[PDB]
């Protein structure tokens, strides 16, 4: 009788920086998508490996809700098989992703006169993330042949940078809140089913 807490994820007052992306486990609950079905303001609502029309009919052994903020031009990167700063260094979907990606323009909440700089991305990393990997380290990034030893300088850079969310920003630089619903199908009891 007890619905999965999608409201807690979609309507959270604070959203995570993409580099420190948030993950909520959803289990042992009825997954009623009817509140997403009656939404029209999402900029994107795509599922991979399942039809959005069948989400109320399906059972999964686990569900994860990952949430974070990115720029408009970067929403494309939240999909299987993408490269770029976000897919490579911040949040990586697997090539065979099963789940749904929902994004919406959050300019009303996430941009301020003078700019909101609270949302960060990783700009540098020694290698690409594996799918669903999270890197929250702040080690000075060694870009040259000489080690940094935690001192910034030439070829020694802080690995994170603020998005600058100004109201004057073009569509591609406006903030977008993202919710990724990842579905797992293992040889294990189903924890999450739809109403029917």
């Amino acid at each position, epitope marked *: 009788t007890n619905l999965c807490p999608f409201g807690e994820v979609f309507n959270a007052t604070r959203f995570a920086s993409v580099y420190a992306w948030n993950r909520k486990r959803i289990s042992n609950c009825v997954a009623d998508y009817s509140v997403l079905y009656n939404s029209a303001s999402f900029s*994107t609502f*795509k*599922c*991979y490996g399942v*039809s*959005p029309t069948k989400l109320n009919d399906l059972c999964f052994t686990n569900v994860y809700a990952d949430s974070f903020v990115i720029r408009g031009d970067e929403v494309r990167q939240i*999909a*299987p098989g993408q490269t770029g700063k976000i897919a490579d260094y911040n949040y990586k979907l697997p090539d065979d992703f099963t789940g749904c990606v929902i994004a919406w323009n959050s300019n009303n909440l996430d941009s301020k006169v003078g700019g909101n700089y609270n949302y960060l991305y990783r700009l540098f990393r020694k290698s690409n993330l594996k799918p669903f990997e999270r890197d929250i380290s702040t080690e000075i990034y060694q870009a040259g042949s000489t080690p940094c030893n935690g001192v910034e300088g030439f070829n020694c850079y802080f690995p994170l940078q603020s998005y600058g969310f100004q109201p004057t920003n073009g569509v591609g630089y406006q903030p977008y809140r993202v919710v990724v619903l990842s579905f797992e199908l293992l040889h294990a009891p189903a924890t999450v089913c739809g109403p029917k």
Partner: nanobody
Amino acid sequence: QVQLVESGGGLVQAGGSLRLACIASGRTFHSYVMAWFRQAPGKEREFVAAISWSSTPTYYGESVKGRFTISRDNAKNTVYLQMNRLKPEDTAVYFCAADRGESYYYTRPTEYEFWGQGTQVTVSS
């Protein structure tokens, strides 16, 4: 680098039938939800039909439901649009579109990453 190429358009009499085809280059076709959009003389791209990876489900715009059939053949990297009982209103450039993802908002052009240049259909009387 994925290309969609539409063919099978030309002149046809009202009441008549036409089969559009769209071939995707490479071997990524199977991973795509395929759709058809159309642009009538001096109007916006309008949704016509879409087909999910497994051939089910299928979707149709209100004005072509019953008359048109979308189908796919993964072995030929081809999506097809069978158009029957054609009217002058069906005169348009028909564009093939493709995405990795199946959208809840399947009628939105912005939900499809890949686009052909389109094939011209003309229905006369």
